[PDB]
């Protein structure tokens, strides 16, 4: 009741001399009447398969937490806007100790369309933009969920 479970897949665009990335997203939503908006929170984790040479594989991970108000249109015209914080960090494989890891945060903004009936048959699609340092992020997500 008054809860939603959605899972989706994200693809992130690569800048020249780089590779694409994949992300998994989980979302929770609260059910609200017309006059208060619905609250959605999403957690995203980025992953990349190992690359040639074991010197640098899946070293970099990205974490993002976003929150925003959904507006429910009875037609398939629903509008959601969300803002989050995303950061990247390098983690040690296990034993090889070194002091080269770095961390940086950026602000992401996204918008999506939503059409939902009861049960799993509700779908949402959103695009997210990360603000432009020497690498710029473009992410498209598609998720499916159910309510109560």
Curated annotation (Swiss-Prot):
Q: Does the keyword Transmembrane apply?
A: yes
Keyword line: Cell outer membrane, Membrane, Signal, Transmembrane, Transmembrane beta strand
> What Pfam families does UniProt report for this protein, alphabetically?
OMP_b-brl
Q: Is Nucleus a UniProt keyword of this protein?
A: no
Q: Where are the transmembrane segments?
A: 3-12, 22-31, 37-46, 63-72, 77-86, 107-116, 121-130, 138-147
As for subcellular location, the record says:
Cell outer membrane
Q: Which residues lie on this side of the membrane: Extracellular?
A: 13-21, 47-62, 87-106, 131-137
Q: What is its main location?
A: membrane
Q: Which residues lie on this side of the membrane: Periplasmic?
A: 1-2, 32-36, 73-76, 117-120, 148
Q: How does it sit in the membrane?
A: Multi-pass membrane protein
Q: Which GO terms describe its cellular component?
A: cell outer membrane; host outer membrane
**Origin, by domain of life?**
Bacteria
**Family, per entry:** Belongs to the outer membrane OOP (TC 1.B.6) superfamily. OmpX family.
Name recorded for this polypeptide: Outer membrane protein X
């Amino acid at each position: 009741a008054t809860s939603t479970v959605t899972g989706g897949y994200a693809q992130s665009d690569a800048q020249g001399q780089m590779n694409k990335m994949g992300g998994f997203n989980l979302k929770y939503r609260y059910e609200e009447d017309n006059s208060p908006l619905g609250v959605i929170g999403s957690f995203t984790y980025t992953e990349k398969s190992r690359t040639a040479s074991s010197g640098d594989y899946n070293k970099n991970q990205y974490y993002g937490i976003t929150a925003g108000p959904a507006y429910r249109i009875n037609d398939w015209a629903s509008i959601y806007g969300v803002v989050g914080v995303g950061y990247g960090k390098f983690q040690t494989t296990e034993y090889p100790t070194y002091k080269h890891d770095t961390s940086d945060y950026g602000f992401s903004y996204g918008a999506g369309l939503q059409f939902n009936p009861m049960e799993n048959v509700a779908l949402d699609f959103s695009y997210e933009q990360s603000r432009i340092r020497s690498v710029d992020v473009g992410t498209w997500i598609a998720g499916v969920g159910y309510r109560f």
